[PDB]
Amino acid sequence: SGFRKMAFPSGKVEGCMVQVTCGTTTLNGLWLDDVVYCPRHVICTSEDMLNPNYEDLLIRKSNHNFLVQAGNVQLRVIGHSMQNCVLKLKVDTANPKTPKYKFVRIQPGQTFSVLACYNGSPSGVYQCAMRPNFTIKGSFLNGSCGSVGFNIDYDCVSFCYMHHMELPTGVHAGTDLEGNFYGPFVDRQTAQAAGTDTTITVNVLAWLYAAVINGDRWFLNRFTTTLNDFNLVAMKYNYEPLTQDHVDILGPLSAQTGIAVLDMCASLKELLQNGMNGRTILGSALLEDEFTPFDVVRQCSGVTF
Amino acid sequence: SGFRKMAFPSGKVEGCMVQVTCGTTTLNGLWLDDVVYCPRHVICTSEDMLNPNYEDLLIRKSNHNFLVQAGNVQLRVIGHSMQNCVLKLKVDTANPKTPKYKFVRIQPGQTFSVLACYNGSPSGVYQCAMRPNFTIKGSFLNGSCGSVGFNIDYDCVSFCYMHHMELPTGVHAGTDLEGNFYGPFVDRQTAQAAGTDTTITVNVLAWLYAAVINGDRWFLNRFTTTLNDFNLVAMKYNYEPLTQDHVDILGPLSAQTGIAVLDMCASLKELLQNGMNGRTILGSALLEDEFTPFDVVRQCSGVTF
Ligand SMILES: O=C1C[C@@H](C(=O)N(c2ccc(-c3c[nH]c(=O)[nH]c3=O)cc2)c2cccc(Cl)c2)c2ccccc21
Ligand SMILES: O=C1C[C@@H](C(=O)N(c2ccc(-c3c[nH]c(=O)[nH]c3=O)cc2)c2cccc(Cl)c2)c2ccccc21
Ligand code: NA
Ligand code: NA
Ligand code: NA
Ligand code: NA
């Protein structure tokens, strides 16, 4: 029993983290096989960040300008190329600690673990969701750039996120491992609008199911609803509209608890309309949306890597 | 910016986890140097758990009854001894992945990371506090026994917790690495009272400081208080009494924010008495007490391992 925001074990990623420097500040990179991946703004001075011409800035750099260090082991850079907002630095040594891995572009509302690093060294790990508006609410300081987000399935690390930037609003923006931003963002020091965000309905429901499994049952009521009715309420409270695809994804949890999805929706409806009246659920006084249906089953059934 | 419940990177501990079996069920052990540490109830059948005579049960076991496996690598057990509620299994091979490490008995109100494991394999990592009543609110299923709690400072893993038991109330109890329970608990399947618990005042204050650093400032008021006045309120709301030692520990955060400790106490007083009026702090609608003053500085200054 119990329910926590659990991250994946970070070891396999820890063995891939390096430091990359290219004339000024140091950031993190990710060493897989014989390639180091890092944010392209490693080549920028503080002044460059205002309006970088990355192509021009990169042209001034050579292989030998990239200093890459894995712990105290210097790596030798033998090629470099820019791909969207990332640099790929070819090194002469394959990382011996490379895990089985894939690059994945995740969907909004999905979750992942972040290994926050500074100077190529791991500081901490936490679980994040990709917000509907393609920001993440992380914990990042200057120099965390290049830290990655990931999931692990069986032996395989699916990298989905590289950290680039804190927006002026204090939320975080980054790319997939091919250097494509999530969301409308660009890598420069400008004010940039994030979408209006919404609450991830399917995740809140998953977390209500987790609560029931864990014995928190006070919010279960005698009402039901329809997808249409529920979605009126979802609209009013800035929740994502629920679809049959979401209902299908919730099937396992519905089966485990014996509580029909639309019955749980009616519980959620009542919580949205009446609040929690100073009660808690799973140690929270708000409706939590950073756990997927997969996350709940993973944790409530003890799957390992 | 941002503030998350951040765990330590788990890699150094992942390399120490093994599976231990001794006639029935498998649990986890911790392999350091040439010793494997695990819960002593690895020697118990389900029936034994009701009222185990551990000394008698252990006498029936020999070195060769302990099957220890590190991934797919069998270890050979060449001695065993019981120490309080743990077994120490001497193996013929020193773990090559042993980190610099210490065993520590932590204080109530301190925090640590838990590497939840099953069958000697890591499932996930999260941050926990030791409650004032010496329970932890974890996330554990059957077979998680032997999972450990730890802190990392520079290169050194301080093991402070080994998981033993879920109480009938759904909170968790365990030992230090010398096998001494935290709290009044014993390793048998009985109803056992935990103390009345309290909120960790010094941690709530630390987290209020974290909020200010992160820009959440609405709860700062024009009042101050005294330690004596504040402690009347602390009493009423089942908070730990604040001492000058706690004030001293909060000094750095007070200096960083320019907010005197007793001024922050007066903010806390007002929150306790009036609630949050449907607002949030650092994404929480309650007063959070699982971050130490050290935790806040660690995260807000980006210290690595
Ligand atoms: O989460 C983060 C990351 C970081 C952040 O956001 N950006 C950032 C700020 C400064 C530099 C920098 C460049 N060159 C130097 O020689 N010295 C520097 O210091 C690089 C990136 C940044 C700013 C705008 C655009 C982009 Cl793509 C990155 C940062 C700074 C403060 C707090 C949090 C964070
Ligand atoms: O967090 C936990 C750990 C676990 C839990 O609490 N206890 C536990 C339950 C069963 C066994 C067991 C022994 N021998 C077998 O052959 N098969 C078994 O299955 C061992 C320990 C336990 C119970 C009482 C006292 C002690 Cl010291 C340990 C457990 C079970 C269910 C849910 C959570 C947890
Ligand atoms: Na960039
Ligand atoms: Na997020
Ligand atoms: Na035990
Ligand atoms: Na706890």
Side-chain angles (χ1 to χ4, degrees), chain A residues 1-71 73 75-235 237-305, chain B residues 1-71 73 75-235 237-305:
Chain A
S1 279
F3 203 71
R4 304 306 307 237
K5 274 262 165 67
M6 277 206 315
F8 290 97
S10 58
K12 285 173 161 35
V13 180
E14 287 172 54
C16 306
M17 301 307 301
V18 300
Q19 176 196 294
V20 181
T21 310
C22 194
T24 56
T25 204
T26 289
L27 45 64
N28 310 278
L30 179 78
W31 180 28
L32 302 174
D33 302 321
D34 58 344
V35 176
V36 173
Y37 300 84
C38 70
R40 70 175 179 171
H41 69 250
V42 66
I43 69 180
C44 293
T45 66
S46 304
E47 177 188 357
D48 287 326
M49 297 299 300
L50 292 182
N51 192 29
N53 189 312
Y54 285 101
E55 297 82 3
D56 289 349
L57 289 173
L58 188 51
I59 281 165
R60 290 158 189 128
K61 301 296 187 185
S62 296
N63 283 347
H64 66 86
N65 298 125
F66 292 100
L67 308 181
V68 185
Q69 165 154 49
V73 341
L75 304 189
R76 179 190 294 286
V77 174
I78 65 173
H80 63 274
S81 66
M82 182 164 64
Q83 177 179 22
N84 302 310
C85 299
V86 297
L87 259 32
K88 285 143 65 192
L89 305 182
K90 193 190 186 57
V91 289
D92 72 348
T93 299
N95 184 355
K97 302 197 196 164
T98 299
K100 229 152 172 297
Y101 78 89
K102 289 179 186 293
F103 290 168
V104 168
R105 184 168 179 85
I106 58 160
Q107 293 300 297
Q110 291 307 117
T111 57
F112 55 93
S113 303
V114 168
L115 181 68
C117 297
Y118 299 91
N119 298 298
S121 288
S123 179
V125 63
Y126 59 83
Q127 186 78 0
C128 268
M130 181 57 71
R131 293 316 299 165
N133 75 355
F134 292 103
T135 62
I136 74 173
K137 292 175 183 266
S139 169
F140 295 106
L141 312 166
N142 200 15
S144 62
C145 311
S147 303
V148 302
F150 68 93
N151 289 273
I152 315 190
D153 185 56
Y154 289 82
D155 59 342
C156 188
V157 184
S158 282
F159 292 101
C160 56
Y161 180 80
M162 175 168 283
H163 182 59
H164 291 233
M165 182 177 49
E166 182 178 293
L167 292 167
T169 65
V171 309
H172 303 109
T175 68
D176 69 17
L177 266 295
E178 298 189 341
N180 300 109
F181 271 89
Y182 294 98
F185 308 114
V186 296
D187 46 351
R188 63 168 296 214
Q189 192 194 126
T190 52
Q192 298 179 48
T196 55
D197 202 25
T198 49
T199 298
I200 309 154
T201 313
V202 60
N203 288 5
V204 175
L205 290 163
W207 170 88
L208 291 175
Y209 278 114
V212 173
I213 291 173
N214 287 278
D216 282 5
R217 276 188 301 95
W218 65 263
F219 56 78
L220 296 175
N221 65 30
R222 62 180 296 79
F223 318 119
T224 197
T225 186
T226 64
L227 215 48
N228 279 258
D229 176 65
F230 174 78
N231 279 343
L232 291 183
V233 185
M235 181 70 63
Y237 290 94
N238 305 323
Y239 271 50
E240 268 164 10
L242 196 71
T243 69
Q244 191 54 48
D245 281 339
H246 296 144
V247 174
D248 288 346
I249 292 172
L250 291 164
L253 289 170
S254 184
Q256 195 171 337
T257 61
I259 300 158
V261 178
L262 279 179
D263 288 6
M264 194 61 90
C265 287
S267 284
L268 178 52
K269 176 169 90 165
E270 286 316 301
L271 288 166
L272 284 172
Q273 289 179 166
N274 298 314
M276 285 196 216
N277 283 111
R279 291 159 287 187
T280 65
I281 299 173
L282 288 179
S284 178
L286 39 76
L287 303 167
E288 169 67 51
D289 78 344
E290 297 199 301
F291 299 98
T292 75
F294 179 98
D295 297 337
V296 173
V297 169
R298 154 167 97 255
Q299 180 170 168
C300 296
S301 305
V303 323
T304 61
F305 314 90
Chain B
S1 279
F3 203 71
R4 304 306 307 237
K5 274 262 165 67
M6 277 206 315
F8 290 97
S10 58
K12 285 173 161 35
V13 180
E14 287 172 54
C16 306
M17 301 307 301
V18 300
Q19 176 196 294
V20 181
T21 310
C22 194
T24 56
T25 204
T26 289
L27 45 64
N28 310 278
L30 179 78
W31 180 28
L32 302 174
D33 302 321
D34 58 344
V35 176
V36 173
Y37 300 84
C38 70
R40 70 175 179 171
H41 69 250
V42 66
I43 69 180
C44 293
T45 66
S46 304
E47 177 188 357
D48 287 326
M49 297 299 300
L50 292 182
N51 192 29
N53 189 312
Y54 285 101
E55 297 82 3
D56 289 349
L57 289 173
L58 188 51
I59 281 165
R60 290 158 189 128
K61 301 296 187 185
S62 296
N63 283 347
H64 66 86
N65 298 125
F66 292 100
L67 308 181
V68 185
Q69 165 154 49
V73 341
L75 304 189
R76 179 190 294 286
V77 174
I78 65 173
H80 63 274
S81 66
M82 182 164 64
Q83 177 179 22
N84 302 310
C85 299
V86 297
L87 259 32
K88 285 143 65 192
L89 305 182
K90 193 190 186 57
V91 289
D92 72 348
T93 299
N95 184 355
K97 302 197 196 164
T98 299
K100 229 152 172 297
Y101 78 89
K102 289 179 186 293
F103 290 168
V104 168
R105 184 168 179 85
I106 58 160
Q107 293 300 297
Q110 291 307 117
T111 57
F112 55 93
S113 303
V114 168
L115 181 68
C117 297
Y118 299 91
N119 298 298
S121 288
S123 179
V125 63
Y126 59 83
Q127 186 78 0
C128 268
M130 181 57 71
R131 293 316 299 165
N133 75 355
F134 292 103
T135 62
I136 74 173
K137 292 175 183 266
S139 169
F140 295 106
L141 312 166
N142 200 15
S144 62
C145 311
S147 303
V148 302
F150 68 93
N151 289 273
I152 315 190
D153 185 56
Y154 289 82
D155 59 342
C156 188
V157 184
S158 282
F159 292 101
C160 56
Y161 180 80
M162 175 168 283
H163 182 59
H164 291 233
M165 182 177 49
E166 182 178 293
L167 292 167
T169 65
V171 309
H172 303 109
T175 68
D176 69 17
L177 266 295
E178 298 189 341
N180 300 109
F181 271 89
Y182 294 98
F185 308 114
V186 296
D187 46 351
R188 63 168 296 214
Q189 192 194 126
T190 52
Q192 298 179 48
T196 55
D197 202 25
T198 49
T199 298
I200 309 154
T201 313
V202 60
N203 288 5
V204 175
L205 290 163
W207 170 88
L208 291 175
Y209 278 114
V212 173
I213 291 173
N214 287 278
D216 282 5
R217 276 188 301 95
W218 65 263
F219 56 78
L220 296 175
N221 65 30
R222 62 180 296 79
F223 318 119
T224 197
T225 186
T226 64
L227 215 48
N228 279 258
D229 176 65
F230 174 78
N231 279 343
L232 291 183
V233 185
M235 181 70 63
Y237 290 94
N238 305 323
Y239 271 50
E240 268 164 10
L242 196 71
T243 69
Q244 191 54 48
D245 281 339
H246 296 144
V247 174
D248 288 346
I249 292 172
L250 291 164
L253 289 170
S254 184
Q256 195 171 337
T257 61
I259 300 158
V261 178
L262 279 179
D263 288 6
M264 194 61 90
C265 287
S267 284
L268 178 52
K269 176 169 90 165
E270 286 316 301
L271 288 166
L272 284 172
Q273 289 179 166
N274 298 314
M276 285 196 216
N277 283 111
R279 291 159 287 187
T280 65
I281 299 173
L282 288 179
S284 178
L286 39 76
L287 303 167
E288 169 67 51
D289 78 344
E290 297 199 301
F291 299 98
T292 75
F294 179 98
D295 297 337
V296 173
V297 169
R298 154 167 97 255
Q299 180 170 168
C300 296
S301 305
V303 323
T304 61
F305 314 90

